Design a protein around this ligand. Structure first.
Ligand code: ATP
Ligand code: ATP
Ligand code: ATP
Ligand code: ATP
Ligand code: ADP
Ligand code: MG
Ligand code: MG
Ligand code: MG
Ligand code: MG
Ligand code: MG
Lengths: 51, 411, 209, 413, 298, 219
């Protein structure tokens, strides 16, 4: 809600506390029955290098 | 009329302490053995006379039938209600805590002259009827702040501050004892007093000595005392604080550590900061805002003064600014003299050894020196205290303040 | 009657499908380091009589450090399979947040949940975030950063608090952080991770293929 | 190598030096403080007597009539009515705290005066309407209608010959001559803010117009708008802006509106939320649909920078009267106000005193006038001299305004 | 008593019994029930520091009539300071094992919680609960938190940290002076706590903890190697000279890691060679590389 | 079916909506922002849904909502209720607006002063969608409005409103009305019967509360 800049004010890992746990726990490593995820967004400024 | 309501029918309750502050030998003399046994004589007789007072009462009538049925007319679990409006046909409307509102009657022996919407009343359960009216209705947070005891000694306790002792006496004691001087010039006495200066100087003592020798009542406020979390609970306690002081005696209010109650009133980004800032902005309103004040004096004290809100420093609110500087080489003698009153002092010592050689240290430092040197005598198996105690004590107390400020640039 | 309690509010207890998802022999050739972590955690948990045979008081905490991707979290996951403990993993980022006071209370929320429970393992994932004092903060909102360490020290080597609590931490370069953490009795173990060398590229290529 | 305590050496101390009067003086002080207690619980005379009338008048009631007013009398409640239906009662009634019933009328009612939205006395068992009520008036606006004159004449607001002139135009002149505005074709402003340094005379101008108003004047306590419950403060705004429409041309004075809302932000997702709901409700009953007509609003603040631009718009606050410091002619008039009612020497001049207060307020000038008489009580006099005031200027201003420029002054003469 | 709970009958709202144990939902952390903690004599080499604490805590409680006859006020403030790992918390637990008194443990960081005003007032409710157990000792953990410095206003520093600190500044030094309640504060960073609770009306004893001497490192080594089982031909004084300024708490780290070498050998025998390898393991350095920083700053 | 007004808070947001209620007969329903907040639980969603069911009973009825940012805020999690009824009033507005198909005849108008409070992804498609911003008057729109409000006075006919737009800058519509009100009373001070260009120039300085002396620099 609003904008996302680099690591200053509330433009922080609030995604990546969830996001790195998704690709761990949603599907792939922790999975059920070859469900498929489709990432789609047009903003990002901060991202994971391990992504 | 001319004398409407005759001003709330209300007396004042002052303190009951200071029974006999005359123990003036101040040493193990037979006078203090004789004086205190006199105090034992009068209080035992005051005990035995009131013991005879509840003993020899052959009077029993127990209500002459009037209040006894009345005490049975009212319910035994007496409850507490709240008026909303007054329908004066002996059938009014009230409100409970939940807001259940009842067309109750007035079961009698209540004059309809001191009941107002807002005044809490007394109710029943079976018929919820108005039996009495609850008086004084103080929330038990302000009654904690009502001092009943004179804690310490009088102005002769502190070690010489007489230029500023005469200042605070002009605004507190002298207008209450002798207000005949002021009508000859029509000048109202000052109201607000700030005590400010470095820590350890005598701010808390000067309030306690006033609270000892007084005649009106006394209220203490410890800093962050009027701060709550319910967003309106903060400013609501301040209204009841000055309400109690106004309803009682022409008394004074001591609010200490007001550096946590004011800093320059800036606007910023935190939401809990504002209920802080709003409570501290209506204290401004109750103090010197709308029409009147009454005979309520306010004494305030900090360590730092420049970080305060300039709306509080202005006259009309506070008319006296009093510095408490660190002592000199003259009144410091009086500090060492008083704190060495009742200790066995060997004749080898000179008080002016530690005074003149070192010229930096507070009054609270000197009390620590006198206690530490007394511990050194028991440390090496002694009763009397010599110079060698004060040589080790003046070291051990002062090693808590850093080495220095700049090298020999200046000369 | 007293119901069976739950203590069920902030659950991170990897217990009983799913903690493990890995066996102990999956890691390729950390043989100095697989032996070293096992001495401080897995060995005193089962063979406690050996330490009492000498009077050792087995060590409390272990600090791992190395480059990002030398197999650090995998070793923590490998312990969680072949232990009988209550494994607790906590990322070092969800308590550096706003709402002044919530940060130090989340440290208390872990250990009150831990010391009420079984012999347990508390794996703090990263403290290459806040781990270093190194100055007196004459600012705002940096003493709140600084005091979470003070709360961490108070419930690590404060009072006794002894029985069967173990703390594992993992970072990058360890010269940055607080020397108050690095005294033994609090962080007894220091383990360095090389990348691989030769003979370790062979072992990881073997096990993956 | 320093240790000096062993239980045998304890018995050395408390026998050396006044073994005669040590406990002999001590337990006398001990049991008398015990006796301070034992008098207090033996008295027990607290006596919180209240509620009771003088016991010479209720004797007729509490003979049988009080017993006659227990069982036949009713504990009926009051409610509100939504509506009714034809040919039958079919009365739909709410409590707003309890449930909503559908009940019958009783026998003692006239079925005409059961209009909608009416407070009615309702039975406890079968919940029938018994007695209709007069409508509810708001209890706390009655508390803040002033009904009282504070005694400040316009002759005490000296130094402000033009700020009163601006303030006379808005408040007083349409209420006494509502002709020249229409007979030329203009409309008076309806909102005036007062801003400036503290202690300058904000409250005085509000206190003096409460004297000469001949109209409804409402002081409003600012922090009554802030409450504990959600939406309660916004409801207090509404009842204020309804009864003002009933009577004609009532004055409403707010004070320190810095407290009741200064800025609207949201970055940390929260904060002063409930304060904003009360503050925005104030705006929509100030401008918007249904303009208010004859309601004049006065506000005053010390920190005008930190206020919302939604209140800075004209149409809500139209005239920005500011208070400044009096130059010289203002201050010489102020000294003659605050020192005419005091015993002074009848030959002193005041223009020399107005020099030595360069940047001063009306509160600081009065503090000099009070302090100079305090020096006369330090000595033994009953009239003030010239040097009494000259020491008072150094006591008030020069003791706090300057300490480096007075001794080391030699750059300026 | 005012502000006291009672038992109320639901029959006729008649009073039944005064209920003790007044409202206090947050003394779970304070006044620890059990003390099977460490003993008094395993401190080992702080005897100057220990005997001063007897003068301020034991002596006024055991014998108050001495200060009556001598004619001085009694002390109540203790500060403990020094580098980390120098026996600051044993001395809290050693006193708490032998105090014969109420011991109230307060760590120095839970006075914050999350709402303004209630994060303060429980400190006032803390010390007034200490009046119930009328002799008491209250202890502070690590005041490098609240108690640091009155900074400026603005959107900097913190108000609420100061709001709690002013109550600590006043419940022991306000209008009402307390009796039979003693405080002990222990932290490093002596110069950055505030100069209003460091005044000698508040804290009377400031006690350092220097790193131990070679004679004192020997005695610390004898305590933790007591249950350790050494063979023969072994000199602790040579090992004590291998520590040029150790902390004292890291003597345990030598004692644990030397016995750890025997554990991996399935052995109970501990030689002197096991210690000399453990000295180089525990003792480390900063290892300041590249030397350009050093020679910019020669 | 969704029209939103936004802009600086002096441009005529409420002033525009009153004219649409004036000339049209189609059952105008005004509604304020903080009216939906009530003290007891669940009362706002009653007040939201009942008015929308009322405006559905009348066919041509349209609804105006002023200060939608009074409730249209970034929703945040809590533990002590507080805002945890406002979203139940907010989502009821969101559920009802997606509850009916976008046909006749219950068009909804909203207007705020600040956009950055509102929930942008919550409108986004078929909710309040049409952006009607109100910019500040440029030059001649200032000179038009000052001519509008000066219709009812005695203006001497040597006054050019273009000359007033030379010196008046960065004003909203309401401050342009405030110059017109204050200039009538300055002529009332000296008892003047009509206005002049000098009378407006002193009324300009009174809006931002200025005054002038002899500044002894300027000969
Ligand atoms: N002038 C004095 N004469 C005698 N005793 C003094 C004097 N000044 C200070 N003291 C000693 O100092 C103590 C009182 O402290 P003081 O009143 O200075 O606190 P304070 O000024 O409120 O300090 P802070 O501002 O740090 O709270 C007393 O115990 C008293 O013995
Ligand atoms: N122009 C003036 N003429 C005479 N007396 C004045 C003047 N200004 C102030 N005073 C005196 O100063 C005292 C305090 O002034 P007052 O509190 O009304 O100022 P204020 O601006 O209302 O303060 P605040 O801004 O804090 O509300 C008044 O009691 C009054 O006697
Ligand atoms: N003189 C000593 N004798 C025996 N053990 C000691 C000594 N000094 C430190 N220790 C050991 O140090 C540990 C206790 O730490 P300590 O009491 O020094 O707290 P601290 O390290 O000062 O606190 P912080 O970590 O905040 O500095 C215990 O394991 C204890 O055995
Ligand atoms: N374009 C315009 N034409 C005529 N008059 C205008 C114009 N703009 C503003 N005004 C005048 O300015 C005043 C402000 O208009 P309005 O009452 O709509 O405020 P607003 O801009 O909606 O304020 P907010 O947006 O803060 O609610 C109106 O009373 C109107 O008389
Ligand atoms: N020595 C190794 N043996 C087997 N797998 C490894 C090894 N090192 C890294 N990996 C793989 O690489 C990934 C590194 O993950 P992780 O340990 O979280 O990185 P980091 O070492 O930065 O914590 C793991 O998923 C693991 O499967
Ligand atoms: Mg003080
Ligand atoms: Mg990892
Ligand atoms: Mg004022
Ligand atoms: Mg410690
Ligand atoms: Mg509008």
């Amino acid at each position: 809600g609003g904008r996302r800049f680099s690591e200053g004010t509330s433009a922080d890992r609030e995604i990546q506390r969830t996001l790195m746990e998704l690709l761990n726990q949603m599907d792939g490593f922790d999975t059920l029955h070859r469900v498929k995820m489709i990432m789609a967004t047009n903003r990002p400024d901060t991202l994971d290098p391990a992504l | 009329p001319t004398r409407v309501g005759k001003k709330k029918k209300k007396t004042k309750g002052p303190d009951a302490a200071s029974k006999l502050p005359l123990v003036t030998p101040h040493t193990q003399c037979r006078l203090k053995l004789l004086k205190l046994e006199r105090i034992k004589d009068y209080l035992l007789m005051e005990e035995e006379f009131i013991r005879n007072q509840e003993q020899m009462k052959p009077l029993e009538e127990k209500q002459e039938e009037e209040r006894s049925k009345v005490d049975d007319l009212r319910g035994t679990p007496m409850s507490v209600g709240t008026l909303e409006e007054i329908i004066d046909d002996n059938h009014a409307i009230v409100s409970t805590s939940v807001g259940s509102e009842h067309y109750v009657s007035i079961l009698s022996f209540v004059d309809k002259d001191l009941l107002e919407p807002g005044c809490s009343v007394l109710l029943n359960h079976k018929v919820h009827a108005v039996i009495g009216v609850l008086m004084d209705d103080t929330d038990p947070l302000v009654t904690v702040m009502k001092v009943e005891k004179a804690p310490q000694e009088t102005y002769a306790d502190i070690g010489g501050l007489d230029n500023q002792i005469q200042e605070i006496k002009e605004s507190v004691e002298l207008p209450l004892t002798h207000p005949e001087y002021y009508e000859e010039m029509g000048i109202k006495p000052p109201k607000g007093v700030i005590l400010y200066g470095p820590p350890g100087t005598g701010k808390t003592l000067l309030a306690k000595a006033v609270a000892n020798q007084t005649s009106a009542t006394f209220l203490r406020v410890v800093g962050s005392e009027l701060i709550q979390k319910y967003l309106g609970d903060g400013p609501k306690l301040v209204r009841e604080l000055f309400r109690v002081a106004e309803e009682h005696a022409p008394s004074i209010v001591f609010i200490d550590e007001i550096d946590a109650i004011g800093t320059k009133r800036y606007d910023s980004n935190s939401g809990g900061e504002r209920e802080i800032q709003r409570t501290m902005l209506e204290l401004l309103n109750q103090l010197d805002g709308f029409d009147s004040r009454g005979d309520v004096k306010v004494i305030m004290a900090t360590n730092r003064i420049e970080t305060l809100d300039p709306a509080l420093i202005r006259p009309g609110r506070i008319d006296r600014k009093i510095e408490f500087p660190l002592p000199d080489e003259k009144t410091k003698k009086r500090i060492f003299q008083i704190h060495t009153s009742r200790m066995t002092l060997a004749d080898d010592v000179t008080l002016d050894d530690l005074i003149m050689a070192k010229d930096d240290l507070s009054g609270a430092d000197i009390k620590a020196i006198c206690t530490e040197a007394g511990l050194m005598a028991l440390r090496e198996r002694r009763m009397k205290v010599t110079n060698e105690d004060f040589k080790k004590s003046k070291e051990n107390v002062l090693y808590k303040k850093q080495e220095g400020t700049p090298e020999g640039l200046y000369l | 009657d007293v119901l069976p309690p739950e203590a069920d509010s902030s659950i991170m207890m990897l217990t009983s499908d799913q903690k493990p998802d890995v066996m102990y022999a999956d890691i390729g050739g950390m043989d100095i380091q697989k032996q070293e972590v096992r001495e401080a955690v897995e060995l005193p948990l089962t063979h406690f009589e050996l330490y009492k045979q000498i009077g050792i008081d087995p060590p409390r905490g272990v600090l791992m450090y190395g480059p990002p991707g030398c197999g650090k979290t995998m070793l923590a996951k490998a312990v969680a399979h072949h232990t009988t403990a209550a494994f607790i993993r906590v990322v070092g980022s969800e308590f550096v947040q706003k709402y002044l006071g919530e940060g130090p209370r989340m440290v208390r929320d872990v250990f009150r949940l831990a010391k009420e429970n079984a012999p347990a393992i508390i794996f703090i994932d990263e403290i290459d975030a806040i781990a270093t004092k190194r100055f007196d903060a004459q600012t705002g909102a940096d003493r709140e950063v600084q005091r979470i360490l003070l709360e961490l020290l108070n419930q690590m080597d404060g009072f006794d608090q002894n029985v069967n609590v173990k703390v594992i931490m993992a970072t990058n370069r360890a010269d940055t952080l607080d020397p108050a953490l690095l005294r033994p009795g609090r962080l007894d173990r220091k383990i360095e991770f090389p990348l691989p060398d030769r003979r370790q590229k062979r072992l990881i290529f073997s096990t993956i293929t | 190598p320093i240790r000096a305590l062993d239980e045998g050496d304890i018995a050395l101390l408390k026998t050396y030096g006044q073994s005669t009067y040590s406990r002999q003086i001590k337990q006398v002080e001990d049991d008398i403080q015990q006796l301070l207690k034992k008098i207090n619980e033996l008295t027990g005379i607290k006596e919180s007597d209240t509620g009771l009338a003088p016991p010479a008048l209720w004797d007729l009631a509490a003979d049988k009539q009080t017993l006659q007013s227990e069982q036949p009398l009713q504990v009926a409640r009051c409610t509100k009515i939504i509506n009714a239906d034809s040919e039958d009662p079919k009365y739909i009634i709410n409590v707003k705290q309890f449930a909503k019933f559908v009940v019958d009328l009783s026998d003692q009612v006239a079925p005409t005066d059961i209009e909608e939205g009416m407070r009615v006395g309702v039975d406890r068992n079968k919940y029938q309407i018994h007695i209709p009520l007069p409508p509810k008036i708001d209890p706390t606006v009655t508390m803040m209608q002033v009904e009282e004159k504070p005694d400040v004449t316009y002759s005490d607001v000296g130094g402000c010959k033009e700020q009163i002139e601006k303030l006379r135009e808005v408040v007083e002149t349409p209420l006494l001559h509502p002709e020249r505005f229409v007979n030329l074709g203009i409309e008076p402003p309806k909102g005036v803010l007062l801003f400036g340094p503290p202690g300058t005379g904000k409250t005085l101008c509000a206190r003096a117009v409460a004297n000469r108003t001949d109209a409804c004047f409402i002081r409003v306590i600012g922090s009554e708008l802030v409450q504990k419950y959600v939406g309660e403060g916004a409801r207090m705004v509404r009842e204020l802006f309804e009864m003002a429409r009933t009577k004609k041309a009532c004055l409403i004075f707010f004070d320190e509106i810095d407290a009741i809302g200064g800025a609207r932000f949201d970055d940390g997702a929260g904060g002063d939320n409930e304060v904003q709901r009360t503050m925005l409700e104030l705006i929509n009953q100030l401008d918007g649909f249904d303009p208010r007509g004859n309601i004049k609003v006065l506000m005053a603040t010390n920190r005008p920078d930190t206020l919302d631009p939604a209140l800075m718009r004209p149409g809500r606050l139209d005239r920005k009267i500011e208070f400044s410091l009096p130059d010289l002619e203002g201050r010489t008039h102020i000294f003659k106000i605050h020192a005419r009612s005091m015993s002074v020497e009848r030959d002193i001049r005041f223009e020399l005193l107005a020099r030595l207060c360069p940047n001063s307020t009306g509160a600081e000038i009065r503090s000099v006038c009070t302090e100079a008489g305090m020096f006369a009580i330090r000595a033994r006099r009953k009239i003030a001299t010239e040097k009494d005031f000259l020491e008072a200027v150094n006591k008030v201003i020069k003791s706090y305004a300057k300490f480096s420029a007075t001794p080391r002054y030699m750059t300026y003469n | 008593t005012p502000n006291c709970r009672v038992a109320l009958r639901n029959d006729s709202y008649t009073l039944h019994k005064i209920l003790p144990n007044k409202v206090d939902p947050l003394v779970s952390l304070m006044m620890v029930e059990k003390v099977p903690d460490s003993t008094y004599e395993m401190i080992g080499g702080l005897d100057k520091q220990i005997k001063e604490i007897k003068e301020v805590i034991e002596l006024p409680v055991k014998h108050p009539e001495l200060f009556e006859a001598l004619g001085i006020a009694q002390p109540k403030g203790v500060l403990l300071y020094g580098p980390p790992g120098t026996g600051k918390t044993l001395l809290a637990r050693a006193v708490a094992h032998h105090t014969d008194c109420t011991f109230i443990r307060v760590s120095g960081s839970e006075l914050v919680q999350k709402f303004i005003g209630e994060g303060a007032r429980m400190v006032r409710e803390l010390f007034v609960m200490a009046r119930e157990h009328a002799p008491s000792i209250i202890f502070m953990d690590e005041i490098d938190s609240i108690g640091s410095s009155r900074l400026e206003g603005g959107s900097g520093g913190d108000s609420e940290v100061q709001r709690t600190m002013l109550e600590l500044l006043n419940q022991l030094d306000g209008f009402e002076a307390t009796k039979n309640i003693k405080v002990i504060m222990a932290t490093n960073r002596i110069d950055i706590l505030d100069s209003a609770l460091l005044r000698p009306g508040r804290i009377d004893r400031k006690i350092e903890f220097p790193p131990p001497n070679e004679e004192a490192r020997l005695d610390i080594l004898k305590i933790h190697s007591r249950k350790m089982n050494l063979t023969r031909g072994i000199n602790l004084r040579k090992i004590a000279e291998l520590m040029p300024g150790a902390s004292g708490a890291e003597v345990k780290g030598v004692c644990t890691e030397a016995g750890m070498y025997a554990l991996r050998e399935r052995r109970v025998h501990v030689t002197q060679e096991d210690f000399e390898m453990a000295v180089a393991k525990v003792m480390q350095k900063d290892s300041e590389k590249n030397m350009s920083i050093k020679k910019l700053w020669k | 079916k969704g029209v939103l007004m936004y802009g600086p808070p002096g441009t005529g947001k409420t002033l525009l909506a009153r004219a649409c209620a004036a000339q049209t007969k189609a059952t105008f329903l005004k509604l304020a922002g903080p009216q939906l907040v009530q003290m007891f639980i669940g009362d706002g969603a009653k007040l939201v849904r009942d008015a929308f069911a009322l405006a559905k009973e009348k066919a041509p009825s349209i609804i105006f909502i002023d200060e939608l940012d009074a409730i249209g805020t970034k929703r945040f999690d809590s533990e002590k209720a507080g805002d945890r009824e406002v979203q139940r009033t907010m989502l009821e507005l969101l559920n009802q607006l997606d509850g009916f198909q976008p046909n006749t005849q219950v068009k909804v108008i909203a207007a705020t002063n600040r956009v950055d409070i509102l929930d942008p992804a919550l409108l986004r498609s078929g909710r309040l969608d049409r952006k009607i911003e109100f910019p500040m008057p440029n030059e001649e729109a200032r000179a038009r409005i000052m001519q509008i409000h000066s219709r009812k006075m005695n203006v001497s006919p040597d006054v050019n409103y273009e000359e007033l737009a030379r010196c008046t800058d960065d004003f909203n519509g309401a401050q342009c009305k405030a110059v017109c009100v204050e200039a009538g009373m300055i002529a009332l001070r000296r008892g003047a019967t009509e206005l002049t260009h000098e009378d407006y120039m002193e009324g300009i300085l009174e809006v931002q509360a200025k005054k002038k002396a002899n500044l002894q620099y300027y000969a």
